[PDB]
Symmetry: none
Subunit: 100 residues, 2 copies
Amino acid sequence: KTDITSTKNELVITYHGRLRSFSEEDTYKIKAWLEDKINSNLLIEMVIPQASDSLRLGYERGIILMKEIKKIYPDVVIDMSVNSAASSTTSKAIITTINK
Amino acid sequence: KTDITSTKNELVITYHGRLRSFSEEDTYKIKAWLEDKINSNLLIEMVIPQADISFSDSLRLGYERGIILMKEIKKIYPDVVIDMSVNSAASSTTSKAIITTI
């Protein structure tokens, strides 16, 4: 259900359902996207819908995602935020590269 | 040692330790800052420095502190609407809560 799509410099996770670990397929996608990213810092935006449960889910998904990225690049520089969207009804994570 | 500093426009809580809540005195400071805010919405940004190892714990601590802070604000100002945001950046040096109006 949760969907991962990416281009050269942007990876977008669109969450669906309950708090989940990443599937084996999602782990591969995130790993495949990071393979060429050794020299990139990462700007991560956790975006949740507008109105505590949703906020908590955004924190927990941010934790999972940090852990996932850190498995590949332990010394990765991350800046990560959590914010409500004006109106999306979607929870998502956007990763942008900043090349170093 | 949790510290509160403010101007008319902005109040910043700098947290010490792992305590989630405030002294009686810091509660009064917050209440005094809110007194001319009855005609305002509020924005809170929880700022969470990055722990090398135990970032899950630090991150959950900021979540919990924001629960308490919103609780304390609404004690004073029951109908206020709060926009909550979180930032955990590499450059973040202190655990703090920034409060602004609108």
